[PDB]
Amino acid sequence: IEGFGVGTWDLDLKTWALDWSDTARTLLGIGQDQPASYDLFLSRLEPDDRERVESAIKRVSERGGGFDVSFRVAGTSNAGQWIRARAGLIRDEAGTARHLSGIFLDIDEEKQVEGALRTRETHLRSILHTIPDAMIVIDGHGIIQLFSTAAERLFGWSELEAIGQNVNILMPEPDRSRHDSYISRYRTTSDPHIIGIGRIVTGKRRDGTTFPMHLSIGEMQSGGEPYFTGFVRDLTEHQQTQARLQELQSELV
Amino acid sequence: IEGFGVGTWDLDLKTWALDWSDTARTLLGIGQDQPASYDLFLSRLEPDDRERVESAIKRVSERGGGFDVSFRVAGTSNAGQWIRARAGLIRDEAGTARHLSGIFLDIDEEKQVEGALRTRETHLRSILHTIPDAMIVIDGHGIIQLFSTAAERLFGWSELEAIGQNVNILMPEPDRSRHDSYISRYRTTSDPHIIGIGRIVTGKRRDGTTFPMHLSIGEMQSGGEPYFTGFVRDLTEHQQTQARLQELQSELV
Ligand code: HEM
Ligand code: HEM
Ligand SMILES: [C-]#N
Ligand SMILES: [C-]#N
């Protein structure tokens, strides 16, 4: 084999011989000189990972549903080469299991993407828990997707209650009945409305109590659908104080 | 082979004959009785990917460092299946490679993860550009990781100027020289929900001017290190209307 970025390997169930290709030994961090061995292989694997490999080899000898295990050999320094081993059985004319044959795949890119996603989700939960303004995310038909802690305290809905509801549950009439059409008309666009301007509206808690609020939308695209992130600033204290200011001034005459 | 979960295929450059695994037939969504053929393979690809596959076989036909391209096949309607095709060259006895041979991998999970990360990154840029409050993310040593649009407007640094700088560039003395010690003193504390307490500090613009500000922090853990997300609110206008309210409340008392 030449230029195959995949390694290959074969483990006879009868003679316990293991042979692998040249790219296979480089992936394991094994030299030229070192001969192929079932025990050299289990030595490149940190302890618990060995148990998973051998338990999987015995299970593939039994029921025989394939072999798929992934592991990190300490191949370089201490960050390692992630590898996914895949294999299936070879039988003889009698149909006894004889050879376990398959591949080693480099999966360092796949594990890097997997952990970049994990960090993103952990950061999203952190923003959702922590942002002082209510943050609401909706899809292109107004259905709430994400709902921050500040939004739960402001609107009286838990995020499990809110998610999957229309965002219109947060609104008094008439905006409540019209909000789907405000979104639909923007989705026709030609930019008559700008999403970024910001506006003061009235929202209402699950109470039925209403309150002034300012909010800001940002738009994003994903998977052929728009999504909108809203940040809500309660203005009850802001308008109690400016009211007291105007009153005091006009009274001092 | 048996429960390999991977298809194998061997195409000859010279005879254009193709043999695929039985497991590879299910991946292409067709072939219950119809024999393998190179024309039938390109028939399952969309006529944008089949152009890419032909360029890839030509590329490896003349000095190719392997063969590695991925594509979505329709499989069956509403059942598109992403797969990754990998292959290498193999020689006869002395001359140019007889047959180009390799594997078909099911990569539906890999591309769900890739798309989920892509959605997360798009959302973070949207949040960063839309959020009204200055959002700043630092690592365990106070190095700025992220810097939102409102942060650049408020502090006077671009994100490209800010990222990789210590967060203490945003503060005056004495806090500027002590902020690193605040972070390390906190990291050897282990009590949760002390970062959750807000505080009123003074910030410093790159301008050199100072302003009162409130901010709130959330911790997260990733990769062995903490990260902190600050939400900064300018209090300049809040403290001056609150001062002109209660000094116009003392015109009579
Ligand atoms: C809960 C209180 C809310 C109220 C009372 C409200 C009200 C409104 C109004 C009055 C308009 C259009 C005004 C006009 O064209 O005459 C509008 C548009 C829109 N709103 Fe809301 N809204 C609320 C929350 C939200 C949230 C939280 C989001 C997104 C996360 C959102 C997304 C949109 C979109 C996409 C549009 C169409 C484009 C635009 O004009 O900005 N709304 N909304
Ligand atoms: C912009 C100007 C800032 C100033 C003037 C400032 C000031 C301070 C002060 C005075 C303390 C310690 C209070 C005490 O010891 O009693 C502190 C602690 C801390 N700061 Fe900042 N800070 C600023 C921005 C930030 C930002 C944006 C973040 C994070 C993204 C941050 C992260 C921390 C952390 C993690 C601590 C320790 C946790 C705590 O006890 O509060 N700082 N900062
Ligand atoms: C919605 N504004
Ligand atoms: C920083 N507080």
Curated annotation (Swiss-Prot), chains A, B:
Does the keyword Amino-acid biosynthesis belong to this entry? no
Identify the residues that the record assigns to the PAC domain, covering every copy: 67-119, 188-247
Enzyme nomenclature, EC number: 2.7.13.3
Q: Which Gene Ontology BP terms does the record give?
A: nitrogen fixation; phosphorelay signal transduction system; regulation of DNA-templated transcription
Q: Which residues of the full protein are shown?
A: 22 to 274 of 505
What cellular component GO annotations does this protein have?
plasma membrane
Name of this protein: Sensor protein FixL
What does this protein's record comment on cofactor binding?
Binds 1 heme group per subunit.
Locate the residues binding heme: 179
Q: Which organism is it from?
A: Bradyrhizobium diazoefficiens (strain JCM 10833 / BCRC 13528 / IAM 13628 / NBRC 14792 / USDA 110)
Cofactors that this protein relies on: heme
The UniProt catalytic activity note for this protein reads: ATP + protein L-histidine = ADP + protein N-phospho-L-histidine
Q: What does this protein do?
A: Putative oxygen sensor; modulates the activity of FixJ, a transcriptional activator of nitrogen fixation fixK gene. FixL probably acts as a kinase that phosphorylates FixJ.
Keywords for this entry? Answer: ATP-binding, Heme, Iron, Kinase, Metal-binding, Nitrogen fixation, Nucleotide-binding, Phosphoprotein, Repeat, Transferase, Two-component regulatory system
Q: Can you give the residue ranges of the PAS domain?
A: 1-64, 120-187
Output one GO MF annotation. metal ion binding
How is activity regulated here?
Answer: The heme moiety regulates the kinase activity.
